[PDB]
Amino acid sequence: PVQQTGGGNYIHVPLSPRTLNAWVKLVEDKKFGAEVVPGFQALSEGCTPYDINQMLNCVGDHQAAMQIIREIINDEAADWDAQHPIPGPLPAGQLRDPRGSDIAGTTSTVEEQIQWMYRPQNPVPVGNIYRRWIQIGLQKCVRMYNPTNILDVKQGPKEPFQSYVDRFYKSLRAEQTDPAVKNWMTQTLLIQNANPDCKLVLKGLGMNPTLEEMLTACQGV
Amino acid sequence: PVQQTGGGNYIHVPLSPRTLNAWVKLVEDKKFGAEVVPGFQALSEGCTPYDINQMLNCVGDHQAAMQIIREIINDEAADWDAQHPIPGPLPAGQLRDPRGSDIAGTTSTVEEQIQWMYRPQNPVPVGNIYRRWIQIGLQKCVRMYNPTNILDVKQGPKEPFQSYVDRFYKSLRAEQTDPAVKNWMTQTLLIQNANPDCKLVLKGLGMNPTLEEMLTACQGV
Amino acid sequence: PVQQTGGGNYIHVPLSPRTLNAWVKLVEDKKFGAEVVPGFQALSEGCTPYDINQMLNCVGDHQAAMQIIREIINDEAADWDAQHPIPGPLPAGQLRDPRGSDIAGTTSTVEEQIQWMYRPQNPVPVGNIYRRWIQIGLQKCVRMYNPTNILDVKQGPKEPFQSYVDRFYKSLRAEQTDPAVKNWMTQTLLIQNANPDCKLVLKGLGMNPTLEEMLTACQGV
């Protein structure tokens, strides 16, 4: 994070321990759930890569997926050298041009990143690009760890349909499939993977039903 | 949210972690009680849409209801477009009168959301309008989740009358009936749906009894 | 069918008796299967609606699916009536411009159908339009009749993967699903709903195996 100073200049201001601690608890309590990506972004909002790295480095308990997150980040950096035509050399006394690794933080400091994040001639984000690389790694972890998949989400006679619907959408959310497939899944697979009593009730509800009407209708099973 | 610096300038700020955390707990622990609507407003009071979405996108349980809220928001934006003239050809370089998904903030950036909130030409307060759309979705869920209903709420023979009242009013609230219906229900259905022993006493109090008088007299029956 | 003779003089002929019979048998035996849609066309190519109406009528055993086809023809004709309305008072020496019902062949005579089909001003092949309207009705029936759905198709333990994929694919076509959904099911639902022994053998293939490679690999499994 950075604090502006009189004259239009900026200085580094450290990230809060509570924010770092809150990130670790979200990772452990939710076990790399799908909600570990968005909460992280808010906790890491207006931050540089240097501070973001600390949070990721603070945890050593789960390093199987933090290692996967690392692979994707350097992959984006490897791709970054071509995505951005190499700028070439500039005179001495001027800031260096940012590369893939500078975005990751394996090499650069918070001040160089602060100067890049607040450069009047060529302002460049180094932490929005990096957090995105981390988030792409975080999402792969969610899908790899997801316990039961959408096709296997099913309702038992005892299970109330509502409960089965929450599990189905949570899994559908963990996956990032095309919306069209989701529509076929949310209108067909949902009625299909139900207890047969309420499935017949959903046939009574009609064709092209809505979630409010499906939930209101099977209120009792 | 929004932070205004000297000179009339406006900037975006992160949303505090505890506010996100408190919103998450209220949604899950209260199982979408009727206080998850106001609990959302206070925590989101004076914030930008970009940070709201996050709060709603940091919760992984009761996800089916979150899908209902998403649909309601889309519909409000549809009506907004119908009631807001597409300005059409506009001076290029003029902040675009925000459209439907520019109030929700999905198709727009936080800065222009802040710029519309205080736009000198025609400020569009994106924040209050979007929170209201979400609130309507939250309110539908409270009703759908509500376990029982006012008509079926009935004092147990051995159950005390006051407990029946706590159950009755909580539902006269969860079911958001018009105030006139509320007066009629409170003046009558709290006596009709009661057990006979206390009902006679409530009739003995006199016509238009008041709740203080009804609770005091039926105390210990 | 129709038959030009001299001076471009088109005339009417009888529809072959073994063509009416073949349509009946294709329908009675394939039970309105998917191939009924094209088999109909090959047996009705160049036939006017009148003769097509005789073929469909000769089938008297199945009359619920034929009604579904009939309900659809009425609609298509009502969209050709609204969008192509009565021209008005046609000048002397003109024939009423073809309407949707004339395309159906219920009102217009075979001669009038031929006059429009070869009309120098309105050469509208009434036959191919009615044939197209019928296909849609036949296709709804195929989807409505198909015995086993894709989610309900699962390989038998004593059955091969190739036999199961054939039952699975036949169904995908009867369901007539969107192409994006088709790819997901074909690359996934064909493995999830497979004998566990061959499912693991479809994992050693790699990622996105092709059907050519999926079968050869599970050959004897």
Residue numbers in the entry:
A (entry chain D), B (entry chain B), C (entry chain C): 1 to 221
Text of the article:
During HIV-1 or HIV-2 infection, the capsid is a necessary component that protects the viral genome and recruits host factors while trafficking to the nucleus. The capsid is comprised of approximately ~1,600 copies of CA molecules, which oligomerize into ~250 hexamers and 12 pentamers (capsomeres) to form the distinct fullerene cone. In this study, we leveraged the approach of templating the HIV CA lattice assembly on liposomes, together with stabilization by the small-molecule host factor inositol hexakisphosphate (IP6),75–79 to produce regular HIV-2 CA lattices.
Pentamer-containing particles were re-processed with C5 symmetry to reconstruct an HIV-2 CA pentamer map to 2.97 Å resolution. The icosahedral pentamer was nearly identical to the pentamer from the CLPs with a model root-mean-square deviation (RMSD) of ~0.7 Å. Specifically, we observed an exchange of polar contacts, as the hydrogen bonding potential of helix 2 residues Q41 and E45 is met by either Y50 and Q54 in the hexameric conformation or N57 and Q54 in the pentamer, allowing a change in register as helix 3 slides along helix 2. Upon shifting to the pentamer, D61 replaces Q63 to ionically interact with adjacent CTD residue R173, while K31 of the NTD contacts the adjacent D166. Despite resolving high-resolution structures of pentamers in the same datasets containing FG-peptide-bound hexamers, no density for either FG peptide was observed to bind to the HIV-2 CA pentamer, like HIV-1, even in the absence of steric hindrance caused by the M66 rearrangement. Furthermore, despite the lack of M66 gating in HIV-2, we did not observe density for either the CPSF6 or Nup153 peptide in the FG pocket of CA pentamers, indicating that another mechanism is responsible for the reduced binding to HIV-2.
